[PDB]
Amino acid sequence: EKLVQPTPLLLSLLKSAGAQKETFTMKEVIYHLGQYIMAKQLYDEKQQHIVHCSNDPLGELFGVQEFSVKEPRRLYAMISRNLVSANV
Amino acid sequence: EKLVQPTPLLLSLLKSAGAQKETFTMKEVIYHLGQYIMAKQLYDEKQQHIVHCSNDPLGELFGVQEFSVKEPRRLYAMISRNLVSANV
């Protein structure tokens, strides 16, 4: 698929989640982001579709206090405004 | 399915992972245990089938430093020696 180049901040989160590249496909970006959320345990204990990022860089990146993985559209928009190139 | 009654220690781990009962089926015990491991992040970052419990009560409970989720037989044996009743 097409390669995307994340901004420095998004790149640092993916890297801390184990990514080794600087260019990925959207599926790798999504995969690595779930690992970051998992490792940091930002999701809600009871309602596990809610991710709380108020005091985490993910909140600075997306600019929200939280989000639902059950709202795919808003999520993709937050990721997209954070790709310096959606076609590398 | 049959109900099992975990020992006090195993009970405290399940409870901390969100369990509300004192009697469960083996599937609930397994479900709650994965949540405990998940919440505490005891699994290995790279080889995610390896659970490190050397400095966690799970290690005291099982009596091991680690284990592989890829060895189902040893796991069930560790759980079984920790049920005061495998039929409640």
């Binding site: 999504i30 779930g34 959320i37 998992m38 999701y43 596990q48 579709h49 993985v69 059950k70 795919p72 999520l75 | 949540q35 998940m38």
Partner: peptide, 11 residues
């Protein structure tokens, strides 16, 4: 349904 489950269903 756990986080992993939902994340894995991303449309």
């Amino acid at each position: 349904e756990t986080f992993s489950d939902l994340w894995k269903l991303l449309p």
